[PDB]
């Protein structure tokens, strides 16, 4: 329609979300927890 500069920030946010999952995975025990890494 006109303006829409959201994809720029959305692309970065997507990468940040992956970090949160990885962080949570390490908190539960990481490799020595039982479940695989969130990648």
UniProtKB/Swiss-Prot annotation:
The modification Serine amide is found at residue 39. Disulfide bonds: none annotated. Expressed by the venom gland. It is found in: Secreted. Belongs to the glucagon family. Venom protein that mimics the incretin hormone glucagon-like peptide 1 (GLP-1). It stimulates insulin synthesis and secretion, protects against beta-cell apoptosis in response to different insults, and promotes beta-cell proliferation. It also promotes satiety, reduces food intake, reduces fat deposition, reduces body weight and inhibits gastric emptying. Interacts with GLP-1 receptor (GLP1R). Induces hypotension that is mediated by relaxation of cardiac smooth muscle. This is Exendin-4. It comes from Heloderma suspectum (Gila monster).
């Amino acid at each position: 329609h006109g303006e829409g500069t959201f994809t720029s920030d959305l692309s970065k946010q997507m990468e940040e979300e992956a970090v949160r999952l990885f962080i949570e995975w390490l908190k539960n025990g990481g490799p020595s927890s039982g479940a695989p890494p969130p990648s």
